[PDB]
């Protein structure tokens, strides 16, 4: 993830120009080398066309250049990059928005689940891992570097997000698919026999619990649907075709044919086909979006921290689990104990953001007073 | 499902060049029987224009020729087919959006549903039983593939969704409708009648069980509107009608006409229409895009594992309320158990990944010691 | 509705090219009427052309064609029809996802409301009555066919959804606006007055009964909604302008000038304007997609099946909430009761979608043994 | 509102075409004085250029104009306006969809909160009628008809919306913003102490009534929300300077020059720019529509009826939480009490919508003996 | 944020136009710098090569003119523009929708929480307080203005959002992550100690507490989140490119050339390339929409109003916890206590809005008395 928000907070002058200076995740680094290639292909039919051809060959050339140039279009291509790409960043927005938080279901289980006592730590502890651990199984299903990361069972063992007890009872459960799904199964049982042992004093908080749990389930499931169903082949293929067709056509109709034949559009023979180079930056940067976005779980610059997210996510829960298990900062009076209408004073640099309230877009009507009176 | 996320994880050099040497949810193997049969029509108008036709046939074919290729436009038919083609796949992600999956629900029956004894098993199986059973009826309602498994309820008794007891209690209860939604009411009769036996402890409990059994109720409802409801048969045939005469044109209005008329644009007769058929290619693939995703449950390369599922669901749910009922790895202290801030280890090939926390954007904005003064 | 789900089940040689073969539902239906008007005013101005002007006349229509066949554009037509398709099109499948459906409310009200004697029959049935009661209410306020057939609150009553009780309550509660929601109110008590009376055993299910209950009052709200603000009069306006514009434009700018003039495009005077006529079947195609869909519950072909859903809502909810209140299939050990991987076989025209299980997109990634090593 | 929905329930000859005959709510309405000032612009520069230039001038201006109508475009406008347009028309949809309805609250109001004499009439209508004031409060914040008719806090009283002991309490508690808030917090107390009174029997249905009164709290800050961020005043300049600069341009542009030049296109001076005319329909027309509905809570013929849904929220409340309290139908035996497949008769205008049930997609496949037999 | 909803209240002569004289938050603001920049450039390359270039580099420079306005495009930028701008307001609008608001939670507070004593308005100020706190830390993680008026937590503690005490457990507890979730935990623990002290009479109501504040959660990490993940930054960057590669070509394509020459579309030089700047008003200002509303939390004229919410957030909330615990109007019949159908009355100037309801769109069909008949 390449965060630039800072840098455009606000519409200052040349505000998305300024971001033309980045190298991290930029469309310098995913198209380079596809416009090296571009480039060297387009020089070398220049090339051939300048030294190799003969006068006859040169002049079919040239008839082939101008039908070629002729068959240019950019209307379909922009329209289905627009429509793909756009499906693109829909489905990877909607798989961060299924990445799974413990933060509703450890808040839950630090309040619900009593003792401060070994059991009781012990227990807040177990339920809020195995939130942990199953989120970690399909994210290393999904994603390459949390797969890098914790590329067997034995590593999330190694790493604690699995005790050895815990993986001796996967293996038993082993069944030929994915089995992320068994953390949420052993997360129900304990919190039942959490509620049968005095641990949890009331069914309504359990139910709130197993609540919080089916929710990062489904989102699991969700990130298991995104990795599983692709966008299909043939969608993908059928851009792919639209934009390279579209450049392997510029690769003869976009040259710059023999100045001396004075031919409409080819009055003089700048070396470098700059436009068309600029067409190559927007159309394939386009694709680049795409074959990005696409899948946001690898390792491109603008993928998703997803081993960041493993981190804190343990960090977090466990502190609140943990430490935070009925440890309340002192309550006394605040500072507005007796002030009906707390005004919060403002800094120098923020003084000027004071705003009145909006009362509503009806506030200023004017009105006579024969006007405002209810009619019988 | 043609599965291509682990091919697209990096914006690598040509990542979308490669998935065209692919042949399985291909768009070779979706359109080349359309294309050869274009191949063949068009090559038959060159064939009788070249030897058939008189001179005054040819410069009337001619003529037509031109005016055919006047009347050849990429606007609408992109437009269209970009509005059609992107409502099949939002269609599409949510007929897989609402296929059910019983993981919530089977949480729940492991831990609710209480008794290790052979009643307690039974009623857990039976609950997990139901939910798979209706999720089946109304696939087998809706996927080619899962009919042909099961094309009749005697099959679904063969194969241990349904009980010989259960398929004679459906046929006593035959409507003149698709009878899916039985299930749903023998789980809630059979939920009920265990709360009143003691096997659920408290309604609360009860209440969650049926919530998450009308959610797979509802989701197998809208299951049944996409299968019933087609995308309107004119918008369909609009498209159609759009994208085929679009290439009917192009069977006359992109033919090589004669070199020695010297007509513009038809100075060399290059025998094969090379751009033609690359807008084949395109606009008939992005057409096939539909075709293929229209009814996601049939048997496209690209259409959803129906019987996949259907295995994998019956599979994993029994495990769940019968195997892992009440049957949890021992809790132990885990492995940060005295380490208040946890930092598990990455691997070599995962050490790039390990971030710094973004803090906000607002994080490093530079404040004078003036302009952070509270002002009175 | 025009089913044909069948028919597109796999993308198949030519699948949208035979449901060009369709008539009900179909655009030829749709737009005959308007094509032969658009044919014979065309043929007119022709007739009018060629007979009636004089050679000066000629020469000024001339002009007029080729001025008039200056001004046909395709953009603005089909951008604008494009997106208010799509807004006709998202408005008719929410309006289809607003339709009640009892079967959520049906499960629970035949789980929770106890008793097999008279008293619990007459209860049951009386609330899933007053759910079908309120539907059929918005029903006949909102679609044509429903209203054709209960045209009176007596035709209700003489058809069952009504008791002569219950309308004459309806008749005391009158108010001058839809009375569809009395039936939630009547509900809402009739299940307190059931709870207060020991036939509710527990205040949490009257809760899910009342929230299911409500759900239903959503949808018809809804239903009403779209009854009630049509999509903007000026939206429909400005599109229906611009559609019957380019075809008046058309009347004359594709008519085929006098081929002795030998203007530029107008050589040859074939009779039919086959192109134009198939950009009018396009485009007024395209337009009738919106005209069908714009009410969805008239009597076009592709309007929703209301009264079908009606009877069938009724039939399936005095089903289940009489006949299969606590009658329930034998609980007995199903076929894998002592199998731990239950494997449902498959037929002989199913075999081929056995599928293994995609564990997940990072599956086969390949380390060497020192990338797998954590790091100190 | 104006509702054409009956209008437009089939897809009849001319269906779009009949709503031309519409003014209230139309195109002609909204921009006859715009077209007007075109047309009079328009008709003033045609008059100088005829007879106040000289001869120079005129060859100056004829230029000039053909520069002009080189510049006219069409793709930019039309995409702006289409992307505009429909984000206006999603946010006047999602203002609809946010605006509160009492009915789910009254039933629940009806239904739990006990006692038919004087304190349980009135607390039930206090309680309802907090419901209606918070709306109210909202309404009139946004919603120019509304405020019209509650000028002042004292017109809410003099309608009986607020007690002077209402009005009292709520300018004691007078915050520099918009108090449309306080009614959910009074509702709120209030419930509270019915329960503790033992007027509502159980905290599961207060839970439900609070559910259901801040639901209608989240629409009405949507309601402020809407009124308070507009959309962009950058984005609505851009599209507004689009527009008018097609049409300023167009004053020059389409000028028709003098036919004794015969320049190309302007061989006939019609006097009429018929098609230019066409053109401002459209594109001001579909302006139009987001004028109209940018602020849907005016007093365009197509903006909300705010007031008539204040009216009949309160009616209708009142009447289910008082009148209706309690007060059921006589429970009997429906019609088809002994009937297990009850089949509502149909009218003869009705008869030919009695449909066969649509069993599913995958009903009608044929498969041999053999391959539905299960394989080993 | 620049509210103009009542200026467009009803769609008036020039509305829009109207709109385009407003200074703040404006096109003219947003663009002037680069209009201007754009300005000297232009006017530089027209001086240039009017004074500095010879005859034979006029000429070249002639001819690279009209090869770049054979090269300017507005079918990509529009198209891209459309798509990228559409995805910023979608965010935008979401942004805003997860802006936390404390009314639900407030509202659950007053009344859940009991005592009038010291206590309890501690506990209850507390509870609201820490919701509030929670707010306050995200919203400086993400919003320039908040984080300028609390630069730090100091800041916090002598604003009051923060006790020392709170301030001093935030210190302990510190991660090296963005501890916002801190008051989540807190309002939890804190809500289960008062639960069983008596505070809070029932574990439902605390259900629902926890509910609503974990609502607020999950709107704080969706701030969280539109902070961190930036829209990607090559598909920024790859519109930026269209826009700025158009006005850059514009530089030289756009140059008025000499007239003396008499080229095509050169007849006349007009020293302002007019229409230039228009579309450079109309595609700079259309990019600098997305350039202000991508980060809608800066101190843009259109950002939203952070502090003003934060202020208002936190008085609202007080004062509803605290002053208007148990605090209601007195309860006495209303203005309509023995009026069955109510009809509060209308001002003169809201009199027209007296609307007959609508009741259905098939209310006004007509049917014969044989049609309407029951067949057998
Ligand atoms: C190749 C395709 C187009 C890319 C062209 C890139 C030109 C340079 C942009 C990158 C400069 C970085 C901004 C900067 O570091 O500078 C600092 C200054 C503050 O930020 C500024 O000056 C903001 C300058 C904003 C540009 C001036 C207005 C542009 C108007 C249209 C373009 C035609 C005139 C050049
Ligand atoms: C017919 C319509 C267009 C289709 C043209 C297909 C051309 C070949 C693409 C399929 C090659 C498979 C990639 C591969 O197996 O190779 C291996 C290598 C690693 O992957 C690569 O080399 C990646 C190569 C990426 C292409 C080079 C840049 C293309 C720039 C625009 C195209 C114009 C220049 C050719
Ligand atoms: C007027 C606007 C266009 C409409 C043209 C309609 C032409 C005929 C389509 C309707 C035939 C029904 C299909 C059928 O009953 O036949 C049976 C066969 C199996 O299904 C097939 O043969 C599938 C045939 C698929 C067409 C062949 C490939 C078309 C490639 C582009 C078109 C240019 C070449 C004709
Ligand atoms: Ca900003
Ligand atoms: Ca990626
Ligand atoms: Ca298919
Ligand atoms: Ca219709
Ligand atoms: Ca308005």
Not at 16 to 25: A, P, V
Not at 200 to 224: K, V
Request: a neutral charge; one cysteine or more; proline letters at 5%.
């Amino acid at each position: 993830t390449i965060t630039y928000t800072s840098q455009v907070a606000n519409a200052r002058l040349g505000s998305f120009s300024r971001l033309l200076l980045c190298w991290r995740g930029s469309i310098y680094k995913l198209l380079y080398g596809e416009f090296l290639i571009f480039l060297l292909c387009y020089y070398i039919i220049r090339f051939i066309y300048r030294l190799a051809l003969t006068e006859e060959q040169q002049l079919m050339f040239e008839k082939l250049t101008l039908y070629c140039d002729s068959y240019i279009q950019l209307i379909p291509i922009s329209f289905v990059l627009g429509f793909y790409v756009t499906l693109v960043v829909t489905r990877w927005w909607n798989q961060y928005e299924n990445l799974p938080w413990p933060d509703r279901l450890m808040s839950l289980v630090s309040g619900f689940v009593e003792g401060k006592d070994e059991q009781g730590r012990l227990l807040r502890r177990t339920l809020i891992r195995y939130a942990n651990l199953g989120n970690v199984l399909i994210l290393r299903s999904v994603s390459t570097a949390v797969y890098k990361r914790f590329p067997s069972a034995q590593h999330l063992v190694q790493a604690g997000f699995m005790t050895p007890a815990e993986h001796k009872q996967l293996e038993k459960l082993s069944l030929p698919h994915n089995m992320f799904w068994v953390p949420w199964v052993w997360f129900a049982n304990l919190s039942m026999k959490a509620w049968l042992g005095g641990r949890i004093r009331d069914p309504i908080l359990l139910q709130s619990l197993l609540n919080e749990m089916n929710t990062l389930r489904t989102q699991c499931g969700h990130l298991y649907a995104y990795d599983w169903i692709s966008i299909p082949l043939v969608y993908t293929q059928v851009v792919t075709v639209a934009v390279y067709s579209f450049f392997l056509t510029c690769l003869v109709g976009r040259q710059f044919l023999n100045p001396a034949k004075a031919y409409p559009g080819h009055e003089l023979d700048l070396v470098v086909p700059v436009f068309t180079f600029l067409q190559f930056f927007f159309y394939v940067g386009w694709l680049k979006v795409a074959e990005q976005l696409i899948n946001p779980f690898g390792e491109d610059d603008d993928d998703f921290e997803t081993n960041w997210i493993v981190d804190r996510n343990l960090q977090v829960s466990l502190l609140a689990v943990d430490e935070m298990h009925q440890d309340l900062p002192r309550m006394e009076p605040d500072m507005y104990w007796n002030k009906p209408e707390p005004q919060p004073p403002y800094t120098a640099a923020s003084a000027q953001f004071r705003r009145a309230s909006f009362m509503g877009s009806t506030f200023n009507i004017s009105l006579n007073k024969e006007e405002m009176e209810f009619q019988p």
